[PDB]
Amino acid sequence: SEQSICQARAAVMVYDDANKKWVPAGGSTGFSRVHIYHHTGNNTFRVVGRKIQDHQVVINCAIPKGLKYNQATQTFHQWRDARQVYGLNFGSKEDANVFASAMMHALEVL
Numbered sequence: 001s002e003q004s005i006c007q008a009r010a011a012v013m014v015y016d017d018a019n020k021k022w023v024p025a026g027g028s029t030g031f032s033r034v035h036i037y038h039h040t041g042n043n044t045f046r047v048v049g050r051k052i053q054d055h056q057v058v059i060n061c062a063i064p065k066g067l068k069y070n071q072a073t074q075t076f077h078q079w080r081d082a083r084q085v086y087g088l089n090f091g092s093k094e095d096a097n098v099f100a101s102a103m104m105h106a107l108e109v110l
């Protein structure tokens with residue numbers, strides 16, 4: 001089965017490569033509950049975020065082994081895939097540190 005190993009509150013953003021700016025994931029700005037989930041068997045992790053107001057899934061992306069997770073500032077962290085760059089604007093330094101730590105520890109289990 002699948003298990004949430006950590007969660008944190010963050011405004012989830014994606015980078016608009018064409019206009020050089022960050023835009024809100026899913027179309028509207030606001031905080032989401034962002035989880036890292038582990039699936040047993042094939043030992044995979046994914047980031048899944050749902051907007052707190054309406055449960056819209058704003059991010060659902062795989063965490064591949066060797067993913068480069070960038071702590072750009074104390075409360076904005078980011079990573080990429082082929083299609084998009086994702087950014088989490090955390091509610092506090094503490095939320096960020098919790099999430100970052102779970103991510104770094106996931107990358108060691110992969």
Ligand SMILES: CC(=O)N[C@@H](Cc1ccccc1Cl)C(=O)N1CCC[C@]12C=C[C@@H]1CC[C@@H](C(=O)N3CC[C@@H]4C=C[C@H]5C=C[C@@H](C(=O)O)N5C(=O)[C@H]43)N1C2=O
Pocket residue numbers: 015022068069070072073076078079080085086087089
């Ligand atoms: C090599 C590479 O991919 N580099 C990436 C970052 C990264 C490094 C390691 C691993 C993964 C990633 Cl995504 C990179 O530099 N990127 C990807 C998106 C666009 C950007 C490339 C150039 C620009 C320059 C400034 C920086 C950026 O986007 N920043 C810096 C921190 C700041 C913090 C928050 C967001 C929120 C709104 C916007 C703003 O402040 O107006 N922000 C920014 O402007 C953010 N940029 C980036 O982060």
Ligand SMILES: [Br-]
Pocket residue numbers: 004
């Ligand atoms: Br829970």
Ligand SMILES: [Br-]
Pocket residue numbers: 039040041042043044
């Ligand atoms: Br496993």
